[PDB]
Amino acid sequence: VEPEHVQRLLLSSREAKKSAYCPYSRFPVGAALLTGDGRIFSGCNIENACYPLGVCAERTAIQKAISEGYKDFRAIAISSDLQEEFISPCGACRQVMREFGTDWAVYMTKPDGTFVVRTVQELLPASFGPEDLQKIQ
Amino acid sequence: VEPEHVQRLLLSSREAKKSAYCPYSRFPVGAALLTGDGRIFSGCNIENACYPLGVCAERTAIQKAISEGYKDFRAIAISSDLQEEFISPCGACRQVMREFGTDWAVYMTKPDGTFVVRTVQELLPASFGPEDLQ
Amino acid sequence: AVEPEHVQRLLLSSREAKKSAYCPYSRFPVGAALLTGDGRIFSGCNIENACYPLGVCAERTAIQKAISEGYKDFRAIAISSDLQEEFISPCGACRQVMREFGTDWAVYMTKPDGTFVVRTVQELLPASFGPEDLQK
Amino acid sequence: VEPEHVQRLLLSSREAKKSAYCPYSRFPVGAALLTGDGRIFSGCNIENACYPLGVCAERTAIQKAISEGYKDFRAIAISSDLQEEFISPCGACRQVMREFGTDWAVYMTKPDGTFVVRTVQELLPASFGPEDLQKIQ
Numbered sequence: 001v002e003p004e005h006v007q008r009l010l011l012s013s014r015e016a017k018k019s020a021y022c023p024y025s026r027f028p029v030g031a032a033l034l035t036g037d038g039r040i041f042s043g044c045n046i047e048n049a050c051y052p053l054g055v056c057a058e059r060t061a062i063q064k065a066i067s068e069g070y071k072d073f074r075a076i077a078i079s080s081d082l083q084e085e086f087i088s089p090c091g092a093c094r095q096v097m098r099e100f101g102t103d104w105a106v107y108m109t110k111p112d113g114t115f116v117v118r119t120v121q122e123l124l125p126a127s128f129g130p131e132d133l134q135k136i137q
Numbered sequence: 138v139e140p141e142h143v144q145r146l147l148l149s150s151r152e153a154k155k156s157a158y159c160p161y162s163r164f165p166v167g168a169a170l171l172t173g174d175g176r177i178f179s180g181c182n183i184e185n186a187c188y189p190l191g192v193c194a195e196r197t198a199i200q201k202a203i204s205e206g207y208k209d210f211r212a213i214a215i216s217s218d219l220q221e222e223f224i225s226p227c228g229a230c231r232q233v234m235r236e237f238g239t240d241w242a243v244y245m246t247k248p249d250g251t252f253v254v255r256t257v258q259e260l261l262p263a264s265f266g267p268e269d270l271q
Numbered sequence: 272a273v274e275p276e277h278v279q280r281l282l283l284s285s286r287e288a289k290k291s292a293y294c295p296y297s298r299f300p301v302g303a304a305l306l307t308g309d310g311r312i313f314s315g316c317n318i319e320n321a322c323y324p325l326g327v328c329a330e331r332t333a334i335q336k337a338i339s340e341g342y343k344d345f346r347a348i349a350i351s352s353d354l355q356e357e358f359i360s361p362c363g364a365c366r367q368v369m370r371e372f373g374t375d376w377a378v379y380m381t382k383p384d385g386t387f388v389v390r391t392v393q394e395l396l397p398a399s400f401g402p403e404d405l406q407k
Numbered sequence: 408v409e410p411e412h413v414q415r416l417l418l419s420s421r422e423a424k425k426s427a428y429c430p431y432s433r434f435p436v437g438a439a440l441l442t443g444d445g446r447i448f449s450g451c452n453i454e455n456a457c458y459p460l461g462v463c464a465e466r467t468a469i470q471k472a473i474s475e476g477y478k479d480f481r482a483i484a485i486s487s488d489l490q491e492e493f494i495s496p497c498g499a500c501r502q503v504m505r506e507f508g509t510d511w512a513v514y515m516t517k518p519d520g521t522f523v524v525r526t527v528q529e530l531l532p533a534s535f536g537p538e539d540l541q542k543i544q
């Protein structure tokens with residue numbers, strides 16, 4: 001029913017959630033990042049005794065990709081155990097997503113397979129970015 | 138919000154920028170928060186040798202306000218030295234703002250005094266929030 | 272060292288600061304108070320977020336408050352929590368922020384009964400990364 | 408001459424530095440993490456226009472490992488272009504390392520291959536950790 005790449009995205013994010021390290025919130029989250037060439041990098045939240053030091057599924061996935069040399073992203077899907085709410089990315093992840101482009105898709109899903117799609121631009125209007133430090137020239 | 142407050146808020150934000158500790162970016166930023174009862178808490182960005190450990194002006198101000206017992210905010214103004222564009226809050230700050238409501242105002246200014254106003258909701262659509270964990 | 276008077280003021284201040292803690296997620300309130308060179312005290316408490324990574328520790332709330340007011344000379348900082356049988360220790364992120372402003376100052380890790388362990392920033396963060404590494 | 412695992416760590420850390428996304432500080436850092444079963448996970452610092460949203464090499468590597476299901480870490484090496492100074496992990500990274508043990512090694516290096524090794528414990532004494540949050544005490 002859904003395009004093949006969307007199927008891959010949803011399945012990978014749901015699978016990625018199994019590796020979540022969240023003994024404090026018991027709120028497992030998984031993510032699957034799709035690059036331009038078709039490769040997928042997965043991620044999950046990894047908390048810390050000192051809450052502020054944890055990391056979200058999206059950034060774990062984006063950080064993995066970049067460390068591997070991939071900066072061209074097409075889309076990223078997110079999965080959680082919230083059955084009645086589309087899992088949405090926090091502002092911090094939106095900012096990191098934005099560092100690598102505003103024109104890519106974020107699939108906010110539910111366990112049943114349903115989802116909402118918004119671009120990074122829509123998720124982060126009038127975004128602060130590289131231009132602020134006059135880095136685009 | 139009362140224009141009397143808006144002005145005091147905008148000035149406080151620029152004044153706060155003078156304390157900025159940003160020897161790495163050399164991009165100082167100030168912010169001023171207005172609570173529901175008219176009290177104003179300001180803040181500035183404080184960087185660190187290891188970049189990830191720095192903090193933004195908005196959060197410095199919000200964190201200050203909360204530590205003083207205030208959690209009901211009406212607006213927050215931001216000021217920087219960037220001439221070409223209105224200084225807007227990074228996603229992390231938008232998420233901290235959201236933690237305490239989506240209906241308040243964010244004043245994104247330019248050094249000359251002009252600005253654009255947007256609510257926390259408009260800056261962080263379809264947000265993740267407290268209700269996700271309740 | 273630091274006079275028992277300032278230490279008591281720091282101690283009472285951190286404990287009092289802990290009352291404002293915003294921590295509905297962990298329900299682990301923490302308070303902190305730092306002493307500047309001129310004797311002024313600034314306090315803070317942890318402030319969490321629905322998305323855990325966006326919270327902040329009590330020490331950084333205090334330090335950032337101090338700096339925002341123009342103070343960057345610290346003599347000592349005291350931390351307090353509800354942990355009965357354990358001295359509350361600052362996390363690594365806070366130690367690194369403390370280090371940005373010196374390594375020779377004192378950190379007081381306390382218990383709810385007033386007992387404490389004191390260590391310098393240098394001792395809590397040895398062979399540290401710092402501003403000097405970016406100059407060279 | 409160093410033990411094979413040390414050579415691998417040193418070399419991987421050096422190679423991972425090439426993927427560093429650090430246009431703001433222009434200070435590239437690489438890290439390599441050795442797990443108990445011998446697998447190595449690399450990472451690099453990934454900055455953001457808004458400085459606070461950046462991530463260090465050590466955590467990029469640790470998060471990669473955990474996302475893949477590895478929590479038993481044996482050692483991690485760090486590399487930078489700092490010629491006459493062993494690159495040291497920031498306090499934030501030492502806290503993340505500590506979440507997964509205090510008794511493993513950290514190799515702080517220089518480009519010439521020389522290094523200083525300390526355990527997580529020595530780099531983060533009287534640390535705050537998971538047990539401080541245990542329900543019963």
Ligand SMILES: O=C1C=CN([C@@H]2O[C@H](CO)[C@@H](O)[C@H]2O)C(=O)C1
Nearest residue numbers: 029045056057088089321322323
């Ligand atoms: O969309 C997202 C919302 C939240 N989280 C993670 O969920 C836990 C609770 O905030 C934390 O571990 C937090 O990082 C994500 O990883 C993604």
Ligand SMILES: O=C1C=CN([C@@H]2O[C@H](CO)[C@@H](O)[C@H]2O)C(=O)C1
Nearest residue numbers: 049050051301317328329360361
């Ligand atoms: O030494 C300290 C240890 C932890 N914390 C705070 O405690 C909660 C649980 O990690 C989080 O809110 C965390 O920030 C401090 O504020 C100080």
Ligand SMILES: O=C1C=CN([C@@H]2O[C@H](CO)[C@@H](O)[C@H]2O)C(=O)C1
Nearest residue numbers: 166182193194225226456457458
């Ligand atoms: O809206 C804002 C944009 C950026 N910053 C700060 O500016 C520096 C460059 O990213 C960093 O110190 C960053 O924290 C703020 O304080 C507020």
Ligand SMILES: O=C1C=CN([C@@H]2O[C@H](CO)[C@@H](O)[C@H]2O)C(=O)C1
Nearest residue numbers: 186187188436452463464495496
């Ligand atoms: O040991 C380390 C010290 C610093 N960093 C990174 O170097 C840049 C300067 O703070 C930042 O990008 C910072 O994250 C590392 O990744 C490792």
Ligand SMILES: [Zn+2]
Nearest residue numbers: 056090092093
């Ligand atoms: Zn996030």
Ligand SMILES: [Zn+2]
Nearest residue numbers: 193227229230
């Ligand atoms: Zn910010």
Ligand SMILES: [Zn+2]
Nearest residue numbers: 328361362365
């Ligand atoms: Zn801390």
Ligand SMILES: [Zn+2]
Nearest residue numbers: 463496497500
């Ligand atoms: Zn680090």
